[PDB]
Ligand binder design. Structure first.
Ligand SMILES: CCCCCCCCCCCCC/C=C/[C@@H](O)[C@H](COP(=O)(O)O)NC(=O)CCCCCCCCCCCCCCC
Length: 206
């Protein structure tokens, strides 16, 4: 179920507005399952996400586990212990900070795409909704060859009508309602993460 995956972002926050890593990885694994379902054309995207989730699971499961309970703890820990490459990637190519940043940026894209689906004409193409949202967000961080591969993948997507109907939550009007319910949770996780990275000047980690 896609609704279950999207609303599971609700579990990432707590009363202290910590962004909890376990639930964050869980939600992303849900998104990976979606990506795998879409087929081999999207496999390069799934593989990159999985690669990053594995980095995070190794950090969260290892000797330093406690420091990775939340994004807030991870930032304080990696900064205190000099585990983040601020300018170019040298001895710390795969810090939790730089790794989560890539997933974070993709969450903004996901937000934009879900809003596009929600507000789109009945006769829209999902390729265009993806392209518009991508060119408006993630595209800025990807080199031309990656932007081309992404664009190619996008063009294989079906009409909006088909894409919504495939979510199996009723008529598009109801799938639109469902997206409206998940979005606030994703937006809030994004906003809290964005402020955390911004306040530590980490928005442009290499
Ligand atoms: C139908 C939706 C199709 C999914 C399209 C997602 C478009 C975004 C594609 C970006 C993938 C980029 C491929 C690899 C880029 C990497 O170089 C770069 C990593 O940097 P690094 O090299 O610095 O370590 N990676 C990134 O930018 C991370 C990209 C992760 C994108 C996650 C996409 C989320 C997929 C979930 C979609 C579910 C939609 C649900 C609608 C019901």
């Amino acid at each position: 179920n896609l609704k279950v995956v999207l609303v599971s972002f609700k579990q990432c926050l707590d009363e202290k507005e910590e962004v909890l890593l376990d639930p964050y990885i869980a939600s992303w694994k849900g998104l990976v399952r979606f990506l795998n379902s879409l087929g081999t054309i999207f496999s390069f995207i799934s593989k990159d996400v999985v690669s990053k989730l594995r980095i995070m699971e190794r950090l969260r499961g290892g000797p330093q586990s406690e420091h990775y309970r939340s994004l807030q703890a991870m930032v304080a820990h990696e900064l205190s212990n000099r585990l983040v490459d601020l300018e170019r990637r040298s001895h710390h190519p795969e810090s939790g900070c730089r790794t989560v940043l890539r997933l974070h940026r993709a969450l903004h894209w996901l937000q934009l795409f879900l809003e596009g689906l929600r507000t789109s004409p009945e006769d829209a193409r999902t390729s265009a909704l993806c392209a518009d949202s991508y060119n408006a967000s993630l595209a800025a961080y990807h080199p031309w060859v990656v932007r081309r591969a992404v664009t190619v993948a996008f063009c294989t997507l079906p009409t909006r009508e088909v894409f919504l109907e495939a979510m199996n939550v009723g008529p598009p009007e109801q799938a639109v309602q469902m997206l409206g319910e998940a979005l606030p949770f994703i937006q809030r996780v994004y906003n809290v993460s964005q402020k955390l990275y911004a306040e530590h000047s980490l928005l442009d980690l290499p």
